[PDB]
């Protein structure tokens, strides 16, 4: 009996289409982020701050066009959680290989699983656990195999603080799920006020550059201000502030800016759509399908790096290990959704 797949898809087709859209948005968001931060390697904080400002005004415009007394305290909690998440990620990605990052995403799956069991009282089926261990074991084995071979430096403490970065983004995802599916706040108002408090908590991210085990992004107490002014000079105008001795094994990354506002704008648009469709998935379906649709981007980034049109001049060949990561993801997610389907059928049957 293999005709049942059509009915199963035609019942709930929006989640698969939304996963396709989130895929096409997340791969392009990361692609354009690394393409602009290869164009402006310095001035990262400025890029994120301007991105949050335009996120805020764009979401307020969209809320005006389309959309306990108030939830500003909850929005501030969400934004501070996201801020410490990006702190711990920015710290952990200094000594972390490209494979352990995908394994870290696959480890953000069960963190979210357990913390959604604990706080907001989920009930998991047999097949759900089987799918999660399937995906995580497969991708862990293959990426740890690839990381034994890579020359990319690695320290276990930095991978651990990357997991510690996964923790508060889970707190924020499930508390926005709470404020969506309990109080019925709008998506757009939430994202606008979250971006407001993200401006503030990124300007409080600013003191993390002071510590010196950063390779090229370390900035002392004296030249944080000039870095900001030079970042505005590069982005908003196109002035290049470092063209002398610069690059690999040196102090700062080399910057080109005469046409970087365009790439930054595309990155910001794709990240805006990423956060928007993320909040839509979290409000509409769950904060647990979102982590699956967010872990699609690990294997898919490797799939997309095969092309020169997407990844500029630094591509790779289709090794079978990327394909088995992809197909392990697919089998795990399929059996996970099947477990969710049995759970929903047993719930609606009673």
């Amino acid at each position: 009996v293999f005709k049942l797949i059509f009915k199963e898809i035609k019942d709930n087709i929006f989640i698969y289409i939304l996963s396709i859209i989130y895929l096409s948005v997340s791969v392009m968001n990361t692609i354009f982020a690394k393409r602009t931060l290869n164009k402006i390697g310095n001035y990262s904080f400025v890029t994120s701050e301007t991105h949050n400002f335009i996120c805020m005004i764009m979401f307020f415009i969209v809320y005006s066009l389309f959309g306990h007394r108030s939830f500003n305290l909850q929005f501030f909690a969400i934004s501070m959680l996201d801020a410490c998440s990006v702190i711990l990620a920015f710290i952990g990605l200094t000594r972390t290989t490209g494979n352990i990052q995908s394994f870290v995403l696959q480890l953000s799956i069960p963190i979210n699983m357990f913390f959604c069991f604990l706080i907001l009282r989920y009930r998991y089926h047999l097949y759900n656990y089987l799918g999660a261990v399937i995906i995580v074991v497969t991708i862990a084995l293959v990426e740890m195999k690839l990381s034994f071979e890579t020359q990319e430096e690695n320290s276990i403490i930095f991978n651990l603080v990357l997991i510690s970065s996964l923790i508060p983004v889970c707190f924020s995802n499930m508390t926005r799920e709470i404020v969506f599916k309990k109080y019925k706040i709008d998506i757009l108002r939430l994202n606008a006020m979250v971006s407001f408090f993200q401006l503030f908590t990124s300007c409080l991210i600013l003191p993390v550059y002071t510590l010196p085990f950063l390779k090229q992004l370390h900035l002392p107490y004296n030249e944080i201000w000039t870095n900001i002014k030079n970042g505005f000079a590069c982005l908003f105008l196109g002035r290049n502030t470092v063209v002398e001795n610069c690059g690999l094994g040196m102090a700062k990354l080399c910057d080109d800016c005469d046409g970087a506002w365009k790439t930054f704008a595309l990155f910001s648009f794709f990240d805006i759509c990423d956060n928007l469709i993320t909040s839509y998935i979290i409000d509409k379906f769950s904060t647990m399908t979102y982590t699956i649709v967010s872990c699609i981007q690990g294997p898919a980034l490797a799939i997309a790096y095969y092309f020169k049109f997407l990844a500029g001049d630094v591509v790779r060949e289709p090794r079978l290990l990327d394909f088995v990561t992809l197909f392990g993801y697919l089998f795990g997610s399929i059996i996970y959704r099947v477990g969710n389907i049995i759970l929903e059928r047993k719930k609606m049957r009673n």
Epitope: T30, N38, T94, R95, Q101, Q151, E152
Partner: antibody, heavy 127, light 105 residues
Framework: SEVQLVESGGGLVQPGGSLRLSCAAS????????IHWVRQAPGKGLEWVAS????????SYADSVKGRFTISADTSKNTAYLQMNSLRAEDTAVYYC??????????????????????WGQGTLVT | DIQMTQSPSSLSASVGDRVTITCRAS??????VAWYQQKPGKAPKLLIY???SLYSGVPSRFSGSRSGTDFTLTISSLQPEDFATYYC?????????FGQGTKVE
């Protein structure tokens, strides 16, 4: 201020013995970068010997020297040592200590580090 | 594991020529290879990192390119200080293998 990597311990050693080389690094911090020894025999190409990441303490060796050599680092004094044991007659060569200069590309959810051997020492001859 | 078979071991080229030194890796290395130039009796200077980018201090004559695994260094116009031995080096997998050299004369 300016980067240097000055070696020591080179010279004549009998076949089947021990020798310790010691590259002292100036300017940059040894902990935040790879350090690796690379040899070349008279009139031949460059051959990798070993490598160390002193912060993780992670050591790697070539296939012809594994189990015989031992690379290490004392990051308190900011140098790096290579002991060669059970030395043969085909290991005579000029040995350079050298680091990886690293370029840190970073998107807000991931980071790729590219490497290239930035600064080389002047080299010590071993026989 | 990976070895880098270098194009022509030694090429003869006068001043003002355009020389192209090629090295193909065995399996799919990414853009992360580098190129050095060692004169007789000195340490190898770094010329190119990541197969496309000039190191700080390198003149504008040297350039790197790739198509798959066949990396290619090229010089726009040789000068009498560009006569040396040129190696390429991968940085993907841990058995580090240089090229066997390429002497310009």
């Amino acid at each position: 201020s300016e980067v240097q990597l000055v070696e020591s311990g080179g010279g004549l050693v009998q076949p089947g013995g021990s020798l310790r080389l010691s590259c002292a690094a100036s300017g940059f911090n040894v902990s935040y970068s790879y350090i690796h020894w690379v040899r070349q025999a008279p009139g031949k190409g460059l051959e990798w010997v070993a490598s160390i990441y002193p912060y993780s303490g992670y050591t790697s060796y070539a296939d012809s020297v594994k189990g015989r050599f031992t690379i290490s680092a004392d990051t308190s004094k900011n140098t790096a040592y290579l002991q060669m044991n059970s030395l043969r007659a085909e290991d005579t060569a000029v040995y350079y200590c050298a680091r990886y200069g690293s370029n840190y590309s970073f998107w807000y959810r991931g980071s790729s580090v590219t490497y290239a051997i930035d600064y080389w020492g002047q080299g010590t001859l071993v026989t | 594991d990976i070895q880098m078979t270098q194009s022509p071991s030694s090429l003869s080229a006068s001043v003002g020529d355009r020389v192209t030194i090629t090295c193909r890796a065995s399996q799919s290395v990414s853009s992360a290879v580098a190129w050095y130039q060692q004169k007789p009796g000195k340490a190898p200077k770094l010329l190119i990192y990541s197969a496309s980018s000039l190191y700080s201090g390198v003149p504008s004559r040297f350039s790197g390119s790739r198509s798959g695994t066949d990396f290619t260094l090229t010089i726009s116009s040789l000068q009498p200080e560009d006569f040396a031995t040129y190696y390429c080096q991968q940085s993907s997998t841990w058995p580090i293998t240089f090229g066997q050299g390429t002497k310009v004369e």
